[PDB]
């Protein structure tokens, strides 16, 4: 078995690993050489005697082919080979990406992982070990599993890091950490036709707004709240909250809470230190009666603590020394919570201690009696730090104990944090990175209630750590370069920032994909994947009703534009108007024609998830003076921090089979704004619409077309006598 060169990999910009056929004899710099002006500085055989780390005097140029030459290499224990020649490049040519499919979950949801090669295909036989920083919040598959089997499961609302250590079939290990956020699936409150409010001024404008919003039928003991209640009449939503003038109210559980009518307003008062269901009976002038029930809750009171981690993995030291957050120490947050799990100032009644029985762990930022005082009881939060001791490689745990009364000998509860200290060398060679970037950017982030999603990533802001060959952390570093791989129609990199291009992606993006970003830090480049989405409900597809349309104009009227024909003529006689905001909020239930004067609209539009977007007469907040239905959202776009470019459509269409009767007229080639003109009764125009594109107004008729195939529609327009 005679020394041959099997692999040559640029492990960083000044270091190259050369792997051989067999075990070899002890070697130094004199044994190796490198072309293109570089000189070899050092050469160190591993303990596996199977490879040699060779460091070069000066960084490799990206994408330059170099040739290593090995002279005088001895085998196992005998013979010396002739000159060996090995080429290599320093670039991330055949990188493998590791991606968490979905990093914002609701409770109950799950997410898989995706591992792909340079050609974008799944890596067969790839394995992964996941681990969660906080298993109260996120839980993961145990042990080592196939990548396609791996699962991250959402358990409780909040936050967790999930380390993914992936083993490729050829034995390479890639390690990265993901940021996972779990949000609550909000509890469905029994709908009682009211909601509890500070004052009537900040209440929903009408019955439709009320049914759309979150309802509050709870209050704390010691409060009073005003009742905002909403009726419909003949199925039609009312236009203002119910008025309690001349009504009388009876309190059915007056020990718990009481009610009083003061002019138009009904005010419920919850009594101190009471709780449970309290009901009321209202009697109106008209001899109708109704009841309703409010949940009174105990006042909030300190109940328990919460810690922001369940396990921590630390390196025994940091390269360069010191105590470095993320490498050889970890800061842990502790929060004080009430009986409903909300933050509450810590008292001075109780105490919390932080302790370990594990030699080699050090607790800092803690009082000498092991307590943490929560800014002497004024704060709902506090913190401590755990630190590894150099070269003491022990795994143990930290206990965080809450005592109801400071003087109690037994704790009321105990939270446990497991801690694993791994050994790293003070002079370890860095060979990879852990870049803790968020998994996903969403162009709609600024409009989502969640404050956790982002519409960009600044890579100068993300924790990045260098790793040794074992996958353990060495040092905190910052990026030297960031660059997009390939091109993409929706996103780009500018400096160190991944972001949306700005060409109206909010209104126009209806797909989702993943982009790759090469990030260089400390002479190492890593390819990291990022998904982009758009959770806005914007038009993605449209459909045209096919059946012939006949419009009979009133003897009073002459004209119908194409925009009116296609999208409809609004008829306010069929709609409900909120006078307070001068907008329509509904189609009456008695409506003879879905809210439209002539024919019903021809176009039905959907969003990316397949849901119908309300259009025309169904747009909540449609202005009082709207004349046609070419609209898919509120003109003023109430509620949005970031607006759509345009809430209307444009259409590409042609006109065929024109037949005019009497004085009827119409253009040979109209736009949306041109009109069918009929002067006398008996005048008519007949024709066929060929609709070719439908798209958001101002966008592109080809690229943003919502219509899969063109469609033809026969139309007749006559005038009544």
């Amino acid at each position, epitope marked *: 078995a005679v020394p041959e060169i099997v692999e040559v990999t640029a492990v960083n910009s000044t270091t190259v690993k050369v792997t051989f056929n067999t075990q070899i004899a002890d070697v130094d710099f004199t044994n190796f050489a490198i072309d293109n002006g570089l000189t070899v500085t050092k050469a160190t055989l591993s303990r596996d005697k199977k490879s040699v780390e060779v460091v070069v005097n000066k960084p490799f140029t990206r994408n330059q082919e170099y040739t290593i030459t090995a002279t005088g290499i001895k085998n196992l224990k005998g013979e010396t080979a002739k000159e060996l020649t090995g080429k290599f490049v320093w670039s991330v040519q055949d990188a493998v990406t590791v991606a968490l499919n979905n990093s914002s979950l609701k409770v109950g949801e799950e997410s898989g992982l995706t591992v792909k090669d340079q050609d974008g295909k799944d890596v067969v036989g790839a394995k992964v070990e996941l681990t969660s920083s906080n298993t109260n919040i996120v839980v993961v598959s145990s042990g080592e599993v196939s990548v396609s089997a791996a699962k991250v499961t959402a358990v409780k609302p909040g936050t967790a890091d999930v380390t993914a250590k992936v083993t490729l079939p050829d034995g390479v290990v890639l390690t990265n950490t993901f940021k996972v956020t779990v949000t609550e699936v909000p509890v*469905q409150v*029994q*709908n*009682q*036709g009211f909601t509890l409010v500070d004052n009537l001024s900040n209440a929903p404008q009408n*019955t439709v707004a009320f*049914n759309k919003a979150e309802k509050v*039928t709870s209050m704390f003991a010691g409060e009073t709240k005003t009742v905002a*209640m*909403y*009726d*419909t*009449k*003949n*199925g*039609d*939503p*009312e236009t203002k909250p*119910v008025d309690f003038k001349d009504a009388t109210v009876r309190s059915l559980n007056p020990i718990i809470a009481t009610a009083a009518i003061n002019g138009s307003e009904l005010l419920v008062t919850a009594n101190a230190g009471q709780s449970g*269901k309290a*009901s009321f009976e209202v009697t109106f002038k*008209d*001899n*109708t*009666k*109704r*009841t*309703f*029930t409010v949940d009174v809750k105990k006042e909030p009171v300190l109940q328990d603590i919460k810690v922001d981690a369940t396990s921590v993995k630390l390196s025994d030291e940091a390269v360069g020394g010191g105590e470095v957050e993320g490498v050889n120490q970890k800061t842990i947050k502790v929060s004080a919570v009430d009986q409903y799990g909300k933050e509450i100032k810590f008292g001075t009644k109780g105490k919390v201690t932080v302790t370990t029985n594990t030699e080699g762990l050090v607790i800092k930022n803690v009082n000498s009696d092991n307590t943490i005082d929560f800014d002497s009881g004024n704060s709902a939060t506090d913190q401590f730090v755990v630190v590894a001791t150099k070269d003491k490689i022990v795994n143990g745990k930290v206990e965080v104990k809450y005592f109801k009364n400071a003087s109690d000998t037994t704790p009321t509860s105990t939270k446990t944090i497991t801690v694993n200290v791994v050994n790293v060398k003070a002079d370890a060679t860095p060979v990879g990175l852990d870049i803790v970037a968020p998994s996903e950017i969403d162009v709609n982030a600024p409009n989502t209630a969640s404050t956790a999603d982002v519409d960009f990533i600044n890579f100068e802001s993300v924790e990045i750590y260098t790793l040794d060959s074992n996958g353990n952390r060495l040092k905190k570093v910052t990026p030297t370069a960031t660059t997009l791989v390939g091109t993409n129609d929706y996103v780009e990199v500018n400096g160190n920032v991944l972001q949306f291009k700005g060409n109206d992606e909010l209104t126009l993006l209806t797909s989702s994909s993943t982009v790759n970003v090469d990030v260089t830090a400390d002479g190492i480049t890593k390819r990291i994947p990022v998904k982009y989405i758009n959770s806005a409900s914007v038009p993605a597809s449209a459909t045209v009703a096919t059946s012939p349309v006949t419009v009979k104009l009133n003897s009073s009227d002459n004209d119908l534009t194409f925009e009116e024909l296609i999208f409809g003529v609004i008829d306010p006689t069929q709609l409900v108007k909120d006078e307070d905001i001068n907008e329509f909020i509904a189609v009456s*239930k*008695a409506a003879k024609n879905d809210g439209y004067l002539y024919n019903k609209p021809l176009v039905t539009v959907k969003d990316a998830s397949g849901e119908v977007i309300p259009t025309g007469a169904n747009v909540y907040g449609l202005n009082h003076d709207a004349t046609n239905g070419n609209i898919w959202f509120d003109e003023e776009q109430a509620g949005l921090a970031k607006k759509f470019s345009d809430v209307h459509f444009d259409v590409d269409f042609s006109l065929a089979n024109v037949v005019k009767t009497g004085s009827g007229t119409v253009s040979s080639s109209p736009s949306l704004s041109d009109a069918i003109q009929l002067t006398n009764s008996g005048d008519a125009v007949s024709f066929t619409l060929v609709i070719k594109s439908i798209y958001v107004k101002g966008a592109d008729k080809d690229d943003n077309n919502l219509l899969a195939a063109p469609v033809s529609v026969n139309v007749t327009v006559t005038k009544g006598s």
Partner: nanobody
Amino acid sequence: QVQLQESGGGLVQAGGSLRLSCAASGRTSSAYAMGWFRQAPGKEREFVAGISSKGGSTYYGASMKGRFTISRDNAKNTVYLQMNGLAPEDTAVYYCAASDKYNFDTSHAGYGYWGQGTQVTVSS
């Protein structure tokens, strides 16, 4: 989609007391506000009383509360109309109705699902 089945109709003498029941079948049928209507002979259909999905709220037609009381058993997903102190003008087909929404609506148009009715007849 929901289905409603009434029970407990029949003959009763003036001054007496009867209970009607209506059981709701479906998938998220638990989530349905329900109500009672009636059509007496010679008269137009009229609203009697209504209840929220979990019985926290009820409402009544003018002058109907007393003579009538609505309640609900959530476990059985059934709703009950209790009639006390009946008189000949309560002779009627009593219908159960259900709705997607709860907003104190006392008209037919506030309700999208109907049972088929039961007859209640009141002697002298």
